[PDB]
A paper describes a structure:
In addition, the molecular interplay of the surface-exposed TlpA (renamed Etrx1) with its extracellular paralogue Etrx2 on oxidative stress resistance and virulence are unknown. The bioinformatic analysis of pneumococcal genomes identified two genes encoding surface-exposed thioredoxin-like lipoproteins, renamed here Etrx1 and Etrx2. According to the accepted catalytic mechanism of thioredoxin-like proteins, Etrx1/Etrx2 would bind their redox partner SpMsrAB2 by means of a hydrophobic surface and subsequently perform a nucleophilic attack on the target disulphide bond via the N-terminal nucleophilic thiolate of the CXXC motif (Cys84 in Etrx1, Cys81 in Etrx2). Surface-exposed Etrx1 and Etrx2 deliver electrons to the SpMsrAB2 protein for the reduction of MsrA2 (by Etrx1 or Etrx2) and MsrB2 (by Etrx2) domains.
The Etrx1 model comprises amino acid residues from Ala53 to Leu187. Etrx1 presents a globular structure (38 × 28 × 29 Å) displaying a thioredoxin-like fold that contains seven β-strands and five α-helices. Besides the canonical Trx fold, Etrx1 has two insertions. The first insertion (residues 53–72) results in β1, β2 and α1 elements, and the second insertion (residues 112–144) gives rise to an additional β-strand (β5) and α-helix (α3). The loop connecting β3 with α2 contains the CXXC motif (84CSIC87) defining the nucleophilic active site Cys84 and the resolving Cys87. These cysteine residues form a disulphide bridge reflecting the oxidized state of the protein. The structural data clearly show that only the active site Cys84 is solvent-exposed and accessible for electron transfer reactions. At the beginning of the second insertion and near the active site there is an additional loop connecting β4 with α3 (residues 112–120) that is not present in the closely related family of cytochrome maturation proteins. Etrx1 lacks this cavity and this region shows differences in both the nature of the amino acids and in the conformation of the β4–α3 loop. In agreement with these results, soaking experiments with Etrx1 crystals did not yield a complex with Cyclofos-3™ even at high concentrations of the detergent.
Author numbering: 53 to 187
The structure:
């Protein structure tokens, strides 16, 4: 199922934009210390993507204890990730769609936009990359 979300960067992202490419989607929240500790890995994976896959991240203001959208966008200015899209979903709908129960959750989507795998929790960078290769 398609989604359309705006990033903290003001860009509008649609899942269908990436038809033909594999997608790694990271679900996270500002309060999640493991999430924050791993964002540098996520940013590297995004930087290194080339034409192989696409990286997106998603926060959900007002859900699972996340800040409001306005407060989140301010807070995020304190962070420094030049290569990471941070899509904002104040509806909480993607959490439901992807069956996200905890943070972080790693989601892997195939070239047709169908969900192949989710993984709750920390995942090492090379394991994420290998998972993408196996799609
Ligand atoms: Mg836009
Ligand atoms: Mg917080
Ligand atoms: Mg925090
Ligand atoms: Mg701590
Ligand atoms: Mg989220
Ligand atoms: Mg949340
Ligand atoms: Mg709460
Ligand atoms: Mg909100
Ligand atoms: Mg910003």
């Amino acid at each position: 199922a398609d989604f359309e979300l705006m990033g903290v960067d003001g860009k509008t992202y649609r899942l269908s934009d990436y038809k033909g490419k594999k997608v790694y989607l990271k679900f996270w929240a500002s309060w999640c210390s493991i999430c924050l500790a791993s964002l540098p890995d996520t940013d590297e994976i995004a930087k290194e993507a080339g034409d192989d896959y696409v990286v997106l991240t998603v926060v959900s203001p007002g859900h699972k204890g996340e800040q409001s959208e306005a407060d989140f966008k301010n807070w995020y200015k304190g962070l420094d990730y030049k290569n990471l899209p941070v899509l904002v979903d104040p509806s909480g709908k993607l959490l439901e769609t992807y069956g996200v129960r905890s943070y972080p959750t790693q989601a892997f989507i195939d070239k047709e936009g169908k969900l192949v795998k989710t993984h709750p929790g920390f995942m090492e960078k090379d394991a994420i990359l290998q998972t993408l290769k196996e799609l």
